Structure 1
Amino acid sequence: SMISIFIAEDAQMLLGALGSLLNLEDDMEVVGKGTTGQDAVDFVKKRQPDVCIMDIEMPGKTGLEAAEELKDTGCKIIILTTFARPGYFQRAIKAGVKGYLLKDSPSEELANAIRSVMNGKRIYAPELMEDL
């Protein structure tokens, strides 16, 4: 009924603002927060949240590396990036991420992608697909 979400973002300002923006939803709940890819692997393998919001560039293990370690878990991973750097998209689809969105997405569109991902859909930003 309530979507449990873990957020992995190394920038505390954004990690805190994302949690605040997602906790405003009636059907969502931020059950944990992390700043590294290992924090995400540790929480998802232990607590098993419905969704894991994953930044790419983080210290230790990137969100893409963390997504590869959680590929065969039942957690739906949504990647968030500011820039669409080459190979990120191909590595994201090969790791089986359910969403690949922009950090600067309006909260309305982010919550909608979380619902679509929970409905089994794959939500990828057109900007991020390395063919325009």
Structure 2
Amino acid sequence: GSMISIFIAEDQQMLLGALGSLLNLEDDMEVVGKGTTGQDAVDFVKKRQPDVCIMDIEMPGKTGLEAAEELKDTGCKIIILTTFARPGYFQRAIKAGVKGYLLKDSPSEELANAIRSVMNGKRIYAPELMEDLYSEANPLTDREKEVLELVADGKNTKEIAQELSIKSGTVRNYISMILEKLEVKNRIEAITRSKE
């Protein structure tokens, strides 16, 4: 009734179960359902309409971000809880209108407080995302700077994989991180320099 009804979507069964127990122990909270894929979240949320959905990003079948996009206007308050502090993930979560974006490297004893704040109409982001992403500095790592150096010289995916002694899919994965990091840094710059 007055309790905050929660659904948890998490593919790692150990964390899913431990989060469910932790949250259920709260007097004002009830874990009404648990799932391991984004489809489990879409199905539950559409059928049962819980107040809150604690959502992992990387899950099989359908991600937490695709699930957040499908549930954009349901009235369910989506709190992303992920290992990944990637700009593309955070940007995609903001566009889906998530109420919260939390990192798995934050105290467990604070999660219930984030749920209460989101129920109070607040938008809760891990300060670390802000501390790392909201910057005009170079976001690229030393490894990413080595990949891009070769790309800028005019070398193809096969040539970069040979020069760095790594797999062809790894070069493509590194390029995806670079494009994402620079696309967010470029959008941040563009918006803040146009507001002047």
Of structures 1 and 2, the one scoring higher in RCO (CA 8 A, sep 6+) is 1
Normalized against structure 1, the TM-score is what? 0.95
Measured after TM superposition, the shift of residue 130 of structure 1 is 7.3
Q: Which has the higher helix share?
A: 2
Preserved contact between residue 86 and residue 130 of structure 1 (Cα < 8 Å): no
Summarize deviations over 1:2-56 as a string: whole Å, max 9, x none: 0000000001000000001111111100000000000000000000000000000
**Where do 4+ consecutive residues of structure 1 move more than 6 Å?**
none
**Deviation readout 1:81-100 (Å, 9 max, x if unpaired):** 11202311111110000000
Secondary structure, in 3 states, of the residue corresponding to 1:129? helix
Deviation readout 1:55-114 (Å, 9 max, x if unpaired): 000001100110000000110000011120231111111000000001232232111110
Report the more deviating stretch, 54-63 or 103-112: 103-112
Helix, strand or coil at the partner of 1:109: helix
> 2-side partners of 1:37 and 1:123: how far apart?
21
RMSD: 1.1
Task: Give the structure with the higher percent strand.
Answer: 1
Q: What does 1:1-132 correspond to in 2, within 5 Å? A: 1-129=2-130, 131=132
The alignment of Structure 1 onto Structure 2 pairs a total of residues equal to 131
Counterpart Cα distance in 2 of 1:104 and 1:21:
16
Distance 2:90 2:60 in 1: 20
Question: TM-score scaled to structure 2, two decimals?
Answer: 0.65
Unpaired runs of 5+ in structure 2? Answer: 133-196
Question: Highest CA radius of gyration, 1 or 2?
Answer: 2
Go from structure 1 to structure 2 and tell me whether the alpha carbon gap of 1:29 and 1:53 turns closer, same or farther (over 3 Å shift).
same
Q: Structure 1 regions of 5+ residues with no counterpart?
A: none
Residue identity (%): 99
